Tab-separated table of C-alpha atoms and ligand atoms in Angstrom:
chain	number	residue	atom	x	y	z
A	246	UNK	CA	58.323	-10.546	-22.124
A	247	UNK	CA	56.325	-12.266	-19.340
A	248	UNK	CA	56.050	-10.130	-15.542
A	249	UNK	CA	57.015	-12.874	-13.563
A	250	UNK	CA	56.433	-11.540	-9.946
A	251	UNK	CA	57.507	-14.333	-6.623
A	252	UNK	CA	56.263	-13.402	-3.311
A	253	UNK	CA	59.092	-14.195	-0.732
A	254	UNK	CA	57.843	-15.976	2.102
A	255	UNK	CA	59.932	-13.874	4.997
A	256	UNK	CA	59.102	-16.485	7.573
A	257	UNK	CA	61.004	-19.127	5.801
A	258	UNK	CA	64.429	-18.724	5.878
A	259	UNK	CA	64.698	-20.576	2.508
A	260	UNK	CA	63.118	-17.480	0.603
A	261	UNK	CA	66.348	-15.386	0.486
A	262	UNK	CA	68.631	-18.198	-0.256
A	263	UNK	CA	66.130	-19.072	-3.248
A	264	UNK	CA	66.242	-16.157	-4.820
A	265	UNK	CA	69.701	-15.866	-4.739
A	266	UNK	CA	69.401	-18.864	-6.924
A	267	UNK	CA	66.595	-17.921	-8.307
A	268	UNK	CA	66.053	-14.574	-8.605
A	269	UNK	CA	66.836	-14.378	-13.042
A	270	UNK	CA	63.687	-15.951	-13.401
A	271	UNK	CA	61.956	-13.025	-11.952
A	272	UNK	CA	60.943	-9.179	-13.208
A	273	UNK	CA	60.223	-8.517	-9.502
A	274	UNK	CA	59.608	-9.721	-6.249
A	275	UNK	CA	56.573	-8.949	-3.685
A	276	UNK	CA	58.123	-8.848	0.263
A	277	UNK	CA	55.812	-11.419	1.548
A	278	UNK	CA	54.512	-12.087	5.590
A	279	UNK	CA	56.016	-8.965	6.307
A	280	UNK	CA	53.481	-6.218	5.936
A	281	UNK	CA	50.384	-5.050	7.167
A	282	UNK	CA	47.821	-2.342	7.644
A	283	UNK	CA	45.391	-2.603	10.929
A	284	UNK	CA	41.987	-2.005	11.975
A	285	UNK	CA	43.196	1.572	13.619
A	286	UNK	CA	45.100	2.383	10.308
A	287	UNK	CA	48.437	1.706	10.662
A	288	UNK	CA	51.187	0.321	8.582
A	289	UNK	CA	52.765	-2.324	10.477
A	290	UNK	CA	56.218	-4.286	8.975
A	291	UNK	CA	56.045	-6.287	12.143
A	292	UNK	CA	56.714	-9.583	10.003
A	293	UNK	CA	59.906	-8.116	9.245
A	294	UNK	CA	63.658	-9.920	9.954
A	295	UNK	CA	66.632	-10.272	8.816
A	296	UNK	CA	66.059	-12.764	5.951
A	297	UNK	CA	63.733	-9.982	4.359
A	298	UNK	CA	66.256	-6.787	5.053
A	299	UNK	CA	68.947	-9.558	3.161
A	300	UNK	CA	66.244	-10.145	0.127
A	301	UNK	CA	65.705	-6.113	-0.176
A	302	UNK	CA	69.458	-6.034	0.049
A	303	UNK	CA	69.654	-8.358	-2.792
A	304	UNK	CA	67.395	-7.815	-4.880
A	305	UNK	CA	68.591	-3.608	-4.609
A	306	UNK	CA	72.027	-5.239	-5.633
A	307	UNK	CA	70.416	-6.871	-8.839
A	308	UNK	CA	68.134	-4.191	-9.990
A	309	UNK	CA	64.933	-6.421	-9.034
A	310	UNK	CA	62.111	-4.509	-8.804
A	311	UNK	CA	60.607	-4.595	-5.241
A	312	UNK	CA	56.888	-4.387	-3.863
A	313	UNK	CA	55.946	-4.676	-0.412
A	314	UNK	CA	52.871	-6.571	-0.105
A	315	UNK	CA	50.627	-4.883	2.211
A	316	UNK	CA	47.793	-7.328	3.821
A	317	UNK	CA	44.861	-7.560	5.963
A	318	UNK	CA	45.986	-10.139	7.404
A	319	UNK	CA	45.618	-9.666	11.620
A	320	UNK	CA	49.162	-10.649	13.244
A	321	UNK	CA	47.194	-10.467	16.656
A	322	UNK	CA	45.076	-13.693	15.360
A	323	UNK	CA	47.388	-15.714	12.527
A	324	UNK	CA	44.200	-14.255	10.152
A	325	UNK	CA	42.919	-12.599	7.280
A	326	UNK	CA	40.590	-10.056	8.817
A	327	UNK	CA	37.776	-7.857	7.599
A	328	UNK	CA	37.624	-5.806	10.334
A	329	UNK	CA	40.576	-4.068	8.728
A	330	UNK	CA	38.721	-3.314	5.018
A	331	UNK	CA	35.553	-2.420	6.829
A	332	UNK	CA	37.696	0.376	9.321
A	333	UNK	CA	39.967	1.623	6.826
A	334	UNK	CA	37.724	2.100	4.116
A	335	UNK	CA	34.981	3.634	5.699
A	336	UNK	CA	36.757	6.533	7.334
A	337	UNK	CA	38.056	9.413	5.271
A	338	UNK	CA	41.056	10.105	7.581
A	339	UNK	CA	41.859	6.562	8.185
A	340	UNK	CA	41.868	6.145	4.487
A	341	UNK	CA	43.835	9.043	3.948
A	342	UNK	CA	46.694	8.348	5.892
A	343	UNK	CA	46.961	4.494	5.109
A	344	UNK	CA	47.688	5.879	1.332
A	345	UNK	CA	50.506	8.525	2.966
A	346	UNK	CA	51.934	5.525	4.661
A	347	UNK	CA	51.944	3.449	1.261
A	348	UNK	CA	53.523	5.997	-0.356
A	349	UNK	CA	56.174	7.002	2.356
A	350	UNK	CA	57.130	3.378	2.417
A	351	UNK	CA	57.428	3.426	-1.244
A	352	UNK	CA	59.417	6.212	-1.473
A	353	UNK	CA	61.733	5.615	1.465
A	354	UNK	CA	62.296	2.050	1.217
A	355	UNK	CA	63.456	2.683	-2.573
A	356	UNK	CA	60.893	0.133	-3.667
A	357	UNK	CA	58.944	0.340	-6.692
A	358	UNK	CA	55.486	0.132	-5.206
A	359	UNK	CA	52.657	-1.488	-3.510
A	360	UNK	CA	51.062	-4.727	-3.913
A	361	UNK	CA	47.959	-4.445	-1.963
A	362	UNK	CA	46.772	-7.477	-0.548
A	363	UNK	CA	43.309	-6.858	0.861
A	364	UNK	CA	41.240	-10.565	0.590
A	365	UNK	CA	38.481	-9.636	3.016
A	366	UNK	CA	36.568	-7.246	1.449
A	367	UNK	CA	33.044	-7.273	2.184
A	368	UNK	CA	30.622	-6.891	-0.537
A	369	UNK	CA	28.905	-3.844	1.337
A	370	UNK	CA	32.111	-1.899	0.969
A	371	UNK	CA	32.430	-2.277	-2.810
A	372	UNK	CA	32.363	1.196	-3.858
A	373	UNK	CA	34.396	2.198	-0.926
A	374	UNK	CA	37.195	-0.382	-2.245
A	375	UNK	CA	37.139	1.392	-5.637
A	376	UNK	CA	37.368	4.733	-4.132
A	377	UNK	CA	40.201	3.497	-1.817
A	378	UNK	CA	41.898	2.034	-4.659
A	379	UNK	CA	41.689	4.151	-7.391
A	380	UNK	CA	43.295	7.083	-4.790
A	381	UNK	CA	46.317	4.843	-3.863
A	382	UNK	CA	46.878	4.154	-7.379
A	383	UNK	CA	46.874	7.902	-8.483
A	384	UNK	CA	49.007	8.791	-5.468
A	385	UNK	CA	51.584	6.130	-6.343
A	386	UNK	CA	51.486	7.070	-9.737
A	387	UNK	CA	52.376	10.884	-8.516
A	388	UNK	CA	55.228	9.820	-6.659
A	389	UNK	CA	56.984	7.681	-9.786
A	390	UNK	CA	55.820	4.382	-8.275
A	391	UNK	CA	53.696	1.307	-9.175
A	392	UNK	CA	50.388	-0.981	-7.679
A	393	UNK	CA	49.961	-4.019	-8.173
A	394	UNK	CA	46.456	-5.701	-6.327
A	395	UNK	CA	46.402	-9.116	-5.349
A	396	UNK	CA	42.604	-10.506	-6.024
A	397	UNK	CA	40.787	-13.758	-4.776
A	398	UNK	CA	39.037	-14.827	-7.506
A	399	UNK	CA	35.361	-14.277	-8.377
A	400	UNK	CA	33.941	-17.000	-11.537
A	401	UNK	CA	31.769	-13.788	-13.025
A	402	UNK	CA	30.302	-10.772	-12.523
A	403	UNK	CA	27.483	-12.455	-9.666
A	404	UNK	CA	29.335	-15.172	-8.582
A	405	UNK	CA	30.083	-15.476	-6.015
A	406	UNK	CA	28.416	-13.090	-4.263
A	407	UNK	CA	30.731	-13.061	-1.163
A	408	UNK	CA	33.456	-11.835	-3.481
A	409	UNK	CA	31.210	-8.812	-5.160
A	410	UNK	CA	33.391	-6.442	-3.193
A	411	UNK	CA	36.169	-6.604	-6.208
A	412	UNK	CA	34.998	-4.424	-9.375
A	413	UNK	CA	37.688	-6.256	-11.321
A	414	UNK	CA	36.908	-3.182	-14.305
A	415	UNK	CA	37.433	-0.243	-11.546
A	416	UNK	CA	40.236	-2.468	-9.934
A	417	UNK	CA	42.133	-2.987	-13.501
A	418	UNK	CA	41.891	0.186	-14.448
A	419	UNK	CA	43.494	1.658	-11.375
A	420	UNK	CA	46.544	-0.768	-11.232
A	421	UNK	CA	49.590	-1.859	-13.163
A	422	UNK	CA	49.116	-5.438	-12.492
A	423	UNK	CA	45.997	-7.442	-11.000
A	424	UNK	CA	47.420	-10.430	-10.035
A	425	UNK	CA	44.764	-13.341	-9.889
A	426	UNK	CA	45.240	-15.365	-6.313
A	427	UNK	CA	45.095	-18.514	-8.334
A	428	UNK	CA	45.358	-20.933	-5.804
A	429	UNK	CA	43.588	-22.883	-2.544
A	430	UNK	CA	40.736	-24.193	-4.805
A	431	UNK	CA	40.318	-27.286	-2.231
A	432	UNK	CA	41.964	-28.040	0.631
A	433	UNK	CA	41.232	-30.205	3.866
A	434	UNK	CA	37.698	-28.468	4.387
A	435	UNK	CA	36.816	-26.910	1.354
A	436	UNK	CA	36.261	-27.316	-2.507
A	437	UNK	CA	36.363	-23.499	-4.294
A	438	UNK	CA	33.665	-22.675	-7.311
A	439	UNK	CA	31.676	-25.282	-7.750
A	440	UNK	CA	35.013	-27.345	-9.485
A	441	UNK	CA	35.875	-31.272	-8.774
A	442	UNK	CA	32.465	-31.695	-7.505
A	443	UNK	CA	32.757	-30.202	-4.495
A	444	UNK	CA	34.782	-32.391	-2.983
A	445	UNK	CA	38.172	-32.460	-1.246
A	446	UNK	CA	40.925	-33.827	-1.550
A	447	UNK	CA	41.736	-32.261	-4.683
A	448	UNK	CA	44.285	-29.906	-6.594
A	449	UNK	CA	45.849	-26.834	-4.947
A	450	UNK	CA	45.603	-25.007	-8.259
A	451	UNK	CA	43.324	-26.949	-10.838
A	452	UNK	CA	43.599	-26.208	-14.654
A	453	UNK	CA	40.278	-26.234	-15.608
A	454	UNK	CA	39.447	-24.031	-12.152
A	455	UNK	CA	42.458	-21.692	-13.688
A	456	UNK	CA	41.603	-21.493	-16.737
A	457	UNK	CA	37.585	-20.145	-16.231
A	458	UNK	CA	39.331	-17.448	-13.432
A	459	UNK	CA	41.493	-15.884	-15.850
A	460	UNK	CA	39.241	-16.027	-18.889
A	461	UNK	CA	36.823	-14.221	-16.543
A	462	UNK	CA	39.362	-12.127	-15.531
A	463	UNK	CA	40.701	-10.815	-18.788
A	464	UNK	CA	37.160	-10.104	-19.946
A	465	UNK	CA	37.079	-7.077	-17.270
A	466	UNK	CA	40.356	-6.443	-17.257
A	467	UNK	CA	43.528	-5.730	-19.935
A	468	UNK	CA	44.833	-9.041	-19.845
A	469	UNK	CA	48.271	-7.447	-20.718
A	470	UNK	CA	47.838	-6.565	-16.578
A	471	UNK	CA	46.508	-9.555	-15.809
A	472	UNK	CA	48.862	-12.320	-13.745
A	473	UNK	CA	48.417	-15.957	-13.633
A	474	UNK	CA	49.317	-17.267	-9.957
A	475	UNK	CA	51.128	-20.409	-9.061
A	476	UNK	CA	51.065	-21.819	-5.687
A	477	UNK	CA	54.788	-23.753	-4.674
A	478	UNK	CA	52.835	-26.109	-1.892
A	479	UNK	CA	50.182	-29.172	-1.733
A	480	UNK	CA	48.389	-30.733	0.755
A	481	UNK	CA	48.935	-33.662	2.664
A	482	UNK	CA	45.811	-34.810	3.686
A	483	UNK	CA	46.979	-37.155	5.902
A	484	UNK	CA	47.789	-34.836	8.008
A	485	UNK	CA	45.546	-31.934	7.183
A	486	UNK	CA	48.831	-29.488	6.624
A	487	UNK	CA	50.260	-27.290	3.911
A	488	UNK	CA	53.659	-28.962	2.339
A	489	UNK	CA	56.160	-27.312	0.051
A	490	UNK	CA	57.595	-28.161	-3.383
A	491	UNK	CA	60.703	-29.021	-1.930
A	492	UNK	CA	58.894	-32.148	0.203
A	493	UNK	CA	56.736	-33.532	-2.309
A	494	UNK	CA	59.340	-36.295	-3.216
A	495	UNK	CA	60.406	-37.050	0.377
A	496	UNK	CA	56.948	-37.357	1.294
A	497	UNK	CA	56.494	-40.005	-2.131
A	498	UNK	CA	59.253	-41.565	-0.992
A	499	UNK	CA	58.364	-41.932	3.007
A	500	UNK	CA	55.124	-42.999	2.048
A	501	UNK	CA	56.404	-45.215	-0.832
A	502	UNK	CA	53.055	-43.670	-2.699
A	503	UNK	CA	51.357	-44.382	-5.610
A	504	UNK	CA	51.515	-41.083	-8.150
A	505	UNK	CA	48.347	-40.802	-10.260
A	506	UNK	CA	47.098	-38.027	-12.003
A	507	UNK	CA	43.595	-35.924	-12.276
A	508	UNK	CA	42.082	-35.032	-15.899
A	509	UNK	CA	40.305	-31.755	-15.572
A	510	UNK	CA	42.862	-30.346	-13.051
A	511	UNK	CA	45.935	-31.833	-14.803
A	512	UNK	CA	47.484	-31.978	-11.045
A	513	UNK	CA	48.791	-35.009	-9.808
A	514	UNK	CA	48.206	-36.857	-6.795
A	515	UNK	CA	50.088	-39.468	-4.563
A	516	UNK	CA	48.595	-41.901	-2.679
A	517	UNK	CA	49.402	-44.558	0.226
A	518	UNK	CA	46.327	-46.427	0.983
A	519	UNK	CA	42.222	-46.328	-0.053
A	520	UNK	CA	41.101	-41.995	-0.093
A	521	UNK	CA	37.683	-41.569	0.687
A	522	UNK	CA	36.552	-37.430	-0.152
A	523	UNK	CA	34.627	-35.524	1.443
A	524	UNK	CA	32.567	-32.017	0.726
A	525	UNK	CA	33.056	-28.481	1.086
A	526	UNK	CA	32.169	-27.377	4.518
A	527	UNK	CA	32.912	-30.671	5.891
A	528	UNK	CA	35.690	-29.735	8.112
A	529	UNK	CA	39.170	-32.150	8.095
A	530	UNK	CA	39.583	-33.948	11.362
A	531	UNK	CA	42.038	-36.447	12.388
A	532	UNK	CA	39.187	-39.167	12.024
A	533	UNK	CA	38.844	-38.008	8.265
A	534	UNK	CA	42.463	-37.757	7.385
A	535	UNK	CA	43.432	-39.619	3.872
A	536	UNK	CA	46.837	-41.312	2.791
A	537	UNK	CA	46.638	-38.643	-0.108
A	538	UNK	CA	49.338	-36.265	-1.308
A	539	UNK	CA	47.911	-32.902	-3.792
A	540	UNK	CA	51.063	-31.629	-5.235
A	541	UNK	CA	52.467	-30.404	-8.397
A	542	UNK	CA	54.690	-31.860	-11.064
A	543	UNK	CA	57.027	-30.032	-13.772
A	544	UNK	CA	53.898	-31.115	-15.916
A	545	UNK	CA	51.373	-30.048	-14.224
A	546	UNK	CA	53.667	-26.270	-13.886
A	547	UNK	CA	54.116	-26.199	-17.369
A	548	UNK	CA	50.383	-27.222	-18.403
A	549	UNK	CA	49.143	-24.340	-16.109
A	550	UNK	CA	51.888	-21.864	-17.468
A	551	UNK	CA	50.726	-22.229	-20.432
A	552	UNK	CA	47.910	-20.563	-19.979
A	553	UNK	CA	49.554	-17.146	-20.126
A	554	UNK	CA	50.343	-18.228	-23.060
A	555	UNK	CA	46.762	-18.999	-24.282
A	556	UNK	CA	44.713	-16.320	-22.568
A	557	UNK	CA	47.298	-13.313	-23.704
A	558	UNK	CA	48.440	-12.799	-20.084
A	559	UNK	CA	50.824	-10.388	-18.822
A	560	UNK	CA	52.245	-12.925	-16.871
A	561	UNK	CA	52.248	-14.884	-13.779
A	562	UNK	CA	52.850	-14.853	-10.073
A	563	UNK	CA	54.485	-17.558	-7.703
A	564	UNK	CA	53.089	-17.881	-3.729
A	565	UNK	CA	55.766	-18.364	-2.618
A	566	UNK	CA	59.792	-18.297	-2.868
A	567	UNK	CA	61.310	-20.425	-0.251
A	568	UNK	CA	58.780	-23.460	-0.924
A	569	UNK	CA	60.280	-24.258	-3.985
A	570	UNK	CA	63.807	-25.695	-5.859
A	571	UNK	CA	65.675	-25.195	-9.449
A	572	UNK	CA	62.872	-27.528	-10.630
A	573	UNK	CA	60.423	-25.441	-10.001
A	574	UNK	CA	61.092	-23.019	-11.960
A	575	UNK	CA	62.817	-24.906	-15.135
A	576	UNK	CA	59.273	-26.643	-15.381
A	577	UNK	CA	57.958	-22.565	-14.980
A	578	UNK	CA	60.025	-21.147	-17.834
A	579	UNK	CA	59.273	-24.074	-19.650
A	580	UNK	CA	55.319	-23.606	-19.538
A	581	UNK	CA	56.807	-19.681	-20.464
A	582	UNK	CA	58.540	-20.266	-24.022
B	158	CL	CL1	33.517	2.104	-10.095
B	159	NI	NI1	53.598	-38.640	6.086
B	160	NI	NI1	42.806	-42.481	-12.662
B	161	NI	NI1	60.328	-25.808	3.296
């Protein structure tokens, strides 16, 4: 059976009244925007509120397997920082006592592990990010507790080389699940791996983009730990912003757009006037905007599901509950079967 793991967004109050729809459709659930370790060493929950204390409550209540997912992501700056990697995993009792902390929070919160969520390691502190990992796996494991990593994705062993701080073998082999961050491929300012010709705007998640991350992926790793990821938001490039599932058709139907559909991403795409694109590294301004929706579709869900499917995968991962509706995940279980 499929590992189907959704990251609640805590900061959207949606997230715990989703998965009390929701939450059958899930093995477990990673406590999202609510975690995170700093550059001095310390676990902070400082993301926490009430909507997350009433999903741990809930999901305790159904048996739903819980991870806190632990970032290095900089509350002081609204950032992903690798200031945090670089301190951390460089200092033997910095190191030391972020895995106590794991663990404590582990064991007292009554959750069954970690999901570490470090995306800015450096590639100078590769072997330090092995070391670091394949401790706080072996100390979770000694308490009765799971990991599960959350990876950007790397296209091979070399490429590219800002990402050759992930030893996806050592990482795999350390962790019960290594979830694949299968998502942001282009945005307003940037065009991931060398896919859609560099341009933006283009798919959130692209199939063919998917498709060479996990097959990469499951050549390093056991692709029965391997996760898929899905990401339940799309782009408006009109306005340069992030919108959720839940909006795509209200923004259609504002904007009275045109839906079309791209090949080699399989995504679809809604637009209200002429799009011009753009390039990686060419930055999204007002003066650049486009009358261009990126969303997703219950095909384009169930194409990209599939994939599990294809590739032998343990299972997939959704970024994240509280974006999304029923449809969602009908169009998710139905990429599954
Ligand atoms: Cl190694
Ligand atoms: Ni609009
Ligand atoms: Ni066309
Ligand atoms: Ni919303």
């Amino acid at each position: 059976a499929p590992f189907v793991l959704a990251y609640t967004d805590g900061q959207v109050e949606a997230s715990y009244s989703n998965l009390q729809a929701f939450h059958r459709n899930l093995s477990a659930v990673g406590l999202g925007s609510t975690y995170g370790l700093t550059v001095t060493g310390k676990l902070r929950q400082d993301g926490m509120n009430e909507t997350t204390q009433n999903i741990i409550r809930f999901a305790k209540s159904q048996s739903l397997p819980l991870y806190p997912t632990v970032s290095d992501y900089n509350e002081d700056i609204g950032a992903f920082d690798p200031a945090i990697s670089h301190s951390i995993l460089n200092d033997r009792a910095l190191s030391a006592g972020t895995v106590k902390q794991l663990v404590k929070l582990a064991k007292e919160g009554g959750f069954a592990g970690i999901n570490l969520d470090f995306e800015k390691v450096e590639p100078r502190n590769r072997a330090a990010f092995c070391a670091f990992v394949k401790t706080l796996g072996n100390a979770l494991h000694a308490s009765n507790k799971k990991l599960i990593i959350s990876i950007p994705p790397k296209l091979s062993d070399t490429e590219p080389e800002y990402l050759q701080g992930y030893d996806y073998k050592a990482l795999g082999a350390a962790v019960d699940y290594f979830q694949v961050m299968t998502y942001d491929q282009v945005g307003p300012g940037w065009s991931s791996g060398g896919f859609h010709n560099e341009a933006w705007p283009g798919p959130e998640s692209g199939f063919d983009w998917q498709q060479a991350l996990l097959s990469y992926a499951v050549s390093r790793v056991p692709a029965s730990k391997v996760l898929a990821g899905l990401p339940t938001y799309g782009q408006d490039y009109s306005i340069g912003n992030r919108v959720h599932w839940s909006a795509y058709q209200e923004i259609i139907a504002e904007h009275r757009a045109a839906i079309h559909r791209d090949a080699a991403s399989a995504t679809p795409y809604a637009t209200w006037g002429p799009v011009k694109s753009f390039v990686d590294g060419v930055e999204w301004t007002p003066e650049r905007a486009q009358p261009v929706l990126w969303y997703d579709d219950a095909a384009s869900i169930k194409t990209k599901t599939a994939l599990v499917t294809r590739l032998g995968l343990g299972g997939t991962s959704v970024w994240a509950m509280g974006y999304e509706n029923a449809g969602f995940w009908a169009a998710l279980q139905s990429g599954l079967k």
